Design a protein around this ligand. Sequence first.
Ligand code: FAD
Ligand code: FAD
Ligand code: EGU
Ligand code: EGU
Ligand code: CL
Ligand code: CL
Lengths: 428, 421
Amino acid sequence: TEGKRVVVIGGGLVGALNACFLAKRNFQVDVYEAREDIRVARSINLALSYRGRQALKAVGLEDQIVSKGVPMKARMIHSLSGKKSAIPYGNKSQYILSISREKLNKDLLTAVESYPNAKVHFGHKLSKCILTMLGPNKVPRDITCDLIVGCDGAYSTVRAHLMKKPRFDYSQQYIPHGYMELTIPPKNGEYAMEPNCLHIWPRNAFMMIALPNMDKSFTCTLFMSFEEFEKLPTHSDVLDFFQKNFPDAIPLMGEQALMRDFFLLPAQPMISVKCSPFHLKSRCVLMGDAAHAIVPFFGQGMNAGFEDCLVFDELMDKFNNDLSVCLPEFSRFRIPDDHAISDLSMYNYIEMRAHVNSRWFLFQRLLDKFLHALMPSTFIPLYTMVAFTRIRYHEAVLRWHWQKKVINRGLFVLGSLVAIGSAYILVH
Amino acid sequence: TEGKRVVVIGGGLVGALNACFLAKRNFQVDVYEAREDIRVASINLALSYRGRQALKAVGLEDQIVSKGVPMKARMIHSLSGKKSAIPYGNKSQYILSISREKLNKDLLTAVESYPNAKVHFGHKLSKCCPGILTMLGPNKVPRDITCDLIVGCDGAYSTVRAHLMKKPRFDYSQQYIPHGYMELTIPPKNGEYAMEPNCLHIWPRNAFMMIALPNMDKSFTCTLFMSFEEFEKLPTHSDVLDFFQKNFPDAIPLMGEQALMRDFFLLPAQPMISVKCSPFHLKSRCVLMGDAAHAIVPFFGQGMNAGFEDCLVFDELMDKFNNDLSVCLPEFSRFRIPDDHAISDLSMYNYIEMRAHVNSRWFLFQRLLDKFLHALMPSTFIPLYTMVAFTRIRYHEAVLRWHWQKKVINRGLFVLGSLVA
Ligand SMILES: Cc1cc2nc3c(=O)[nH]c(=O)nc-3n(C[C@H](O)[C@H](O)[C@H](O)COP(=O)(O)OP(=O)(O)OC[C@H]3O[C@@H](n4cnc5c(N)ncnc54)[C@H](O)[C@@H]3O)c2cc1C
Ligand SMILES: Cc1cc2nc3c(=O)[nH]c(=O)nc-3n(C[C@H](O)[C@H](O)[C@H](O)COP(=O)(O)OP(=O)(O)OC[C@H]3O[C@@H](n4cnc5c(N)ncnc54)[C@H](O)[C@@H]3O)c2cc1C
Ligand SMILES: COc1ccc2c(c1)CN(c1nc(C(=O)N(C)c3cc(Cl)c(F)cc3C(=O)O)c(Cl)s1)C2
Ligand SMILES: COc1ccc2c(c1)CN(c1nc(C(=O)N(C)c3cc(Cl)c(F)cc3C(=O)O)c(Cl)s1)C2
Ligand SMILES: [Cl-]
Ligand SMILES: [Cl-]
């Protein structure tokens, strides 16, 4: 019905979105957010794709977010040699777009407040032992409800309770790599690079990507194993490194501001958490990074959490607001998918260490483009499937494996027919 | 050295043993056991080389080995009623059935045999720090206590570990497997053992499995593994009987025809939990051992044995490096984690293998095949189970050698097979 009450832990990206979706069903939705309100007081800007956008669309916020974003119509690949090679995101109608973390969060907290049947209680934490604190600490004044939604991010308190509950599978892995942000400013008030591209500098042990902001700049994030981060404790090491591996960056970024920004704070650890199931007896449910913290190697963390919100809302339609049905159906329907994108993201991260240089990224993608054009749509590349559709993640993995099977089997018969065809036309 | 104090959290198998090892180098060791003294207030399990070697190091091999029953072979009960004995490797090589409780008691007694050791029954732990908060005999008596070392030996659902889990660069995972387990008893028959008393008795089915281990009174304790789903479908005696008649037919006459009913409905199927974590320590002040650090699924007879080995390998290090905990704690994690992960893995592999590829017959063929090739080459083929059960070859090295063999044979017999035919 309308006048059941729900509390959302976390006023983050997913927390705020879910609040809107719920408010939009006339729930009494109270949001509790640890930090102080960001509109007065981890990444900087993220890649927003179809799944996130479809979820934004259901609350009528797609347009507002889309407008403050910069499109990325292509990948732009910065070879070691220096060669700049571009490859499009799918067809001409399909483009991911770069948006800012903060702008995204802010418009969302304001969208929460636009529903009079929704409030957002800033400066309220959830303590380690189910009490929500007020402004002044040790003011234990929690208050009960028909639903508690954990959107408290990757280091979720709500999940920490659920972990002690029974038949709850859970896993948390810090990967060897860490990430650090570095800005490319405008060169004479204009973007220093082609601004409707995702920029990549793919090496083997290291990786840099850069995404465009509106103020004509880019924010780059740098992935390398904490190992190498150890080996560059001095400014000469950093410079030496950038000169060796990232030749064209130094002019683009500030050659001396590079050094202020690198040593500003330490390479950030990336965490992977899986768990199952996502719910508990129609009283509690996890969502987004609280349910699934993935390594950031597919541009899907926020998108998938946004999609969680949506898939819930679809089930609330499909089962007339029965929480006792929706909560188990969410776990059943969605866990397979959220696990799959987790795996994909991890795999990508592994691939990224073994073999991507300037050259293989191009071959691998242009091969995929070759085969889509060859046999559309019986081959849709993976990156298209995740980025520009709502095909379920695990189905996308399936299709992706099957396809890979028929490319390998297909290539084999042609290799063999070459291999007998050459011999026959060599003997006679 | 004698100046330093250590707290062992848990007075179970690993706690009690570790407390001995530690007491035996004059630490002030205090064991804190949340249960009451079991000597005044897996019923039984499979002891082997690794555990025995640890026990030996502390002068308790003999005592424990006396109250155990040698198991010189596996004995496989096929659905037909056929009974095939597969030996353990060699005549010297045999595993032995012992009681969890006797084992625990003798060790609690050994702990107290040291004047510099104490065990504190009815004391639980709340919270700790690298200064800890233990609960008195009376609940809500949270006195603080301090030490130079805190040893998590508090089992699979470990409090100490729950603290380490919050720290940075700490990988952890728990997974409840889908089967639970239940103990049943095969009593004595006319005062004698109802089956060959020096075997590990197996009844392998696919969804199910039962094993049985001989006690000293002339009985066996069975542990039955089946999926919680299946357990759900047997609420009434008639159903249990009808099930048993299908799947384990020679059991209804072996077991108390209605002892089965007493024991089966005594309490519910127990869950099995795999937990893995890394690393096993927190900077020279806190270490995990046994199931605090590695709760493996009970399908290789090795959980107690590995955790016993932990205590020994810690000791080996404390010897190597003159009792420096700053060195021994990192070296513990560095040396032991790969091994303890390997045995966990082996176990789960086994647990899955049992769910498809073993009915009655493959167990016989796999083992006899294996034994042909060891006999053929006594130092290049040592079978897996021999390496774990009867040696201290490191677990991960045993997995290495095991895969290696598997390949040189797959290779060498795809060669004989494909080339000459
Ligand atoms: C380097 C990097 C790059 C990324 N790039 C992309 C990308 O290109 N595209 C994409 O889709 N995703 C990306 N992501 C993923 C994205 O950051 C997350 O998926 C997204 O933030 C999830 O939203 P959330 O609300 O679940 O978590 P969060 O955004 O972390 O929100 C959690 C909120 O809960 C609050 N909170 C926490 N604990 C408590 C408590 N106890 N009580 C009350 N409140 C609490 C926090 O203060 C915070 O406000 C990236 C992540 C990283 C790290
Ligand atoms: C069905 C089954 C079969 C098995 N078969 C075999 C086998 O054949 N061979 C083999 O080697 N191993 C076997 N095992 C494994 C064996 O049971 C365990 O390895 C062993 O008990 C681990 O010892 P531990 O002391 O670490 O754990 P435990 O024996 O669980 O000891 C933990 C102790 O700490 C106490 N404690 C817990 N929390 C606290 C707290 N907060 N404060 C104070 N005290 C606390 C508990 O009361 C308990 O007494 C089997 C296990 C099962 C379930
Ligand atoms: C800090 O903000 C961040 C951090 C990481 C990412 C993003 C924003 C956005 N990124 C996206 N990745 C894909 C993708 O499908 N894959 C396989 C790729 C993966 C990597 Cl790592 C890459 F460099 C390019 C592609 C590619 O194909 O463009 C998208 Cl689609 S968007 C990753
Ligand atoms: C409740 O008490 C329990 C529970 C499980 C076990 C035991 C006692 C003792 N068990 C031992 N397993 C091995 C072993 O090496 N393997 C791989 C085997 C694994 C299984 Cl499941 C099996 F049935 C036989 C063998 C076998 O070969 O004997 C030993 Cl060696 S001892 C498992
Ligand atoms: Cl992400
Ligand atoms: Cl075990």
